[PDB]
């Protein structure tokens, strides 16, 4: 069996979150938890909460074994960008793109 | 830098107010055009 967890409309650009996602792809959840805890980065705080949700789902819904689990798939998709205005010099206006991300994590007992 | 808009409600109402518009033939035509267009704020009164 496999489980899924997602965090949609996250306040971070996918490019920044993908750096952390590449560290735990194909790792034991236990090993991935330790990699995110001691990773001095913000996206790691978000990914760790998505992973933790996947663990809880399996133990609750599927009553799975924790140690027998491990990450299977993880990907960060681009989310809706929020349009803002940044006043520049000489009356010119630039548009800020506060990018968002959709984080997804998958675990399995395979 | 000293900009163009130096607000003064007195000068605002005396220059573009309702009674200032109703005091001339052409000022009354301004209100007629704004009434025909459907403006919610005919003037700068309040």
């Amino acid at each position: 069996m496999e489980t899924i967890a997602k965090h949609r409309h996250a306040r971070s650009s996918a490019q920044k979150v993908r750096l952390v996602a590449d560290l735990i792809r194909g790792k034991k959840v236990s090993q991935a938890l330790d990699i995110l805890t001691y990773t001095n980065k913000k996206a790691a705080v978000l990914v760790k909460k998505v992973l933790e949700s996947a663990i809880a789902n399996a133990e609750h819904n599927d009553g799975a074994d924790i140690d027998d689990l491990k990450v299977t798939k993880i990907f960060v998709d681009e989310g809706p960008s929020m349009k803002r205005i940044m006043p520049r010099a000489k009356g010119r206006a630039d548009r800020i793109l506060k990018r968002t991300s959709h984080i997804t994590v998958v675990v399995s007992d395979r | 830098m000293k900009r163009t808009f130096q607000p003064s409600v007195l000068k605002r109402n005396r220059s573009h107010g309702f009674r200032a518009r109703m005091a001339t033939k052409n000022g009354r035509q301004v209100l007629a055009r704004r009434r025909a267009k459907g403006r919610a704020r005919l003037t700068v009164s309040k």
Partner: protein, 56 residues
């Protein structure tokens, strides 16, 4: 000052070939509490080499 042609997805990814992060492969483990942490750093509970350094 500015580009004459739009760079490609390839050059973009090629430039990001060195932007990947590294993960600490190992973590310290005290023989007193058994809890693991970074090396040359202190644990959460505070134990350190079986001397009970700062607790509170």
């Amino acid at each position: 000052a500015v580009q004459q042609n739009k760079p490609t997805r390839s050059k973009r990814g090629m430039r990001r070939s060195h932007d990947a992060l590294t993960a600490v492969t190992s973590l310290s483990v005290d023989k007193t509490s058994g809890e693991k942490h970074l090396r040359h750093h202190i644990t959460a509970d505070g134990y350190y080499r079986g001397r009970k350094v700062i607790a509170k």
